[PDB]
Amino acid sequence: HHHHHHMVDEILKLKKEKGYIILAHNFQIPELQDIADFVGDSLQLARKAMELSEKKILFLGVDFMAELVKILNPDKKVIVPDRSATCPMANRLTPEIIREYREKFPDAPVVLYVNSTSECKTLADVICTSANAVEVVKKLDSSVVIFGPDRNLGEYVAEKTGKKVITIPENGHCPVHQFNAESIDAVRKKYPDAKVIVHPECPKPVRDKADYVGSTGQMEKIPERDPSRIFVIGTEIGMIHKLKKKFPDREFVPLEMAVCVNMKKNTLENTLHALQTESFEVILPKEVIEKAKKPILRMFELMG
């Protein structure tokens, strides 16, 4: 909107002037997606940052993602506008629980979802995303794996791979994606020709009623091969804007309104403040960077 056109102009000039690149997660408000150089998922953004000349990064998302970017770009300054933006699911897994479960099942590799603390990543055998988790677990020798922090994704991986997936912590889940299956019944009657796409973080009954299950990266490729005029989307509300932007010819309908409060902590105002003050810098110990990079590079190595 034109009322913010002077705010946007100061963001563009400062970003240009100080050599920032702005990376925004798909769950950011539309206003921040519209000012970002690249919008996508966590790993997509971090990988993207490795490729660029900009020595400074403004990251718009939540803490474990900004740290991922820093882990993989450690000589680059990474700032976030709100340091309290975090992932409640990720924060429920701890080093202690991982260590507890490694002892119980010492032959099982620890596969950690990218939505995990940096400290947790130092202890994982490999990282995955919702896009590549099935393939990653498939390529591991073992037929029993330890997986966290999301139980639903773990269970999905178990279904797709046929392997035993021991999920940690107990009842690990994303509250944003706990859609109700009756919501799918309801949209099918309302839009009989619509396709339902939901995230694998969604519970089993929702995944099973959906036409497609995939990551937000996967969602945004579906209309390249599906010609449907209407898609119903089971993930965080920010993806609707992303999808509408990429495919203006289609209609994107939320399965339900689902908002990640932590993702919405970032605003045009605090983003502007961040660029004015070049704060808040993501600072990690060298040793955590060194150790946590290992399972992240292995993920890339395995998928290569």
Annotated binding residues: 25, 42, 87, 113-115, 130, 174, 199-201, 216, 260
Subset of residues 16 to 75 that bind ligand SF4, contact rule: CB under 6 A: 62
Q: Is 263 in the site for ligand SF4 (CB under 6 A)?
A: yes
* Distance in angstroms (rounded) separating the CA atoms of residues 157 and 194: 26
For the bound state, the minimum distance from the C-beta of residue 163 to ligand PHT, rounded and expressed in Å, comes to 21
Which residue lies nearer to ligand PHT by CB, 44 or 122? Answer: 44
* Distance in angstroms (rounded) separating the CA atoms of residues 76 and 289: 13
Q: Is 115 in the site for ligand SF4 (CB under 6 A)?
A: yes
Tell me the one-letter amino acid at 221: K
DSSP state, residue 249: T
Q: Are 233 and 243 in contact (CB under 8 A)?
A: yes
For the bound state, the minimum distance from the C-beta of residue 201 to ligand SF4, rounded and expressed in Å, comes to 6
Residues 6+ apart with CB under 8 A from 94: 120, 169
Using the contact rule CB under 6 A, the part of the chain among 70-78, 164-172, 260-268, 283-291 near ligand SF4 is 260-268
Which residue lies nearer to ligand PHT by CB, 95 or 175? Answer: 175
Q: Is 165 in the site for ligand SF4 (CB under 6 A)?
A: no
Which residue lies nearer to ligand PHT by CB, 21 or 272? Answer: 21
Going by C-alpha positions, the residue among 210, 229, 204, 77 that lies closest to residue 150 is: 204
Subset of residues 172 to 191 that bind ligand SF4, contact rule: CB under 6 A: 174, 176
Residue 215 binding partner per list ligand SF4, ligand PHT, none, with a CB distance cut-off of 5 to 8 Å that depends on partner kind: ligand PHT
Using the contact rule CB under 6 A, the part of the chain among 3-11, 118-126, 164-172, 259-267 near ligand SF4 is 259-267
Does an H or E element contain 59, and which? strand 56-60
Residue 220 binding partner per list ligand SF4, ligand PHT, none, with a CB distance cut-off of 5 to 8 Å that depends on partner kind: none
Binding residues for [4Fe-4S] cluster, by number, are 87, 174, 260
Going by C-alpha positions, the residue among 179, 222, 183 that lies closest to residue 204 is: 179
Handedness of CA 272, 278, 280, 284 (dihedral sign): positive
Q: Which residue has the tokens 């993207």?
A: 48
* Distance in angstroms (rounded) separating the CA atoms of residues 36 and 45: 11
38 - beta bridge partners?
23
* Distance in angstroms (rounded) separating the CA atoms of residues 170 and 167: 7
Which residue lies nearer to ligand PHT by CB, 146 or 176? Answer: 176
Which residue lies nearer to ligand PHT by CB, 114 or 232? Answer: 114
Which residue lies nearer to ligand SF4 by CB, 116 or 271? Answer: 116
Instruction: Point out which residues bind ligand PHT (CB under 6 A).
Output: 41-42, 114-115, 129-130, 199, 215-217
233 - beta bridge partners?
197, 254
Residues of this chain that interact with ligand SF4 (CB under 6 A) are: 62, 87-89, 115, 174, 176, 236, 260, 262-263
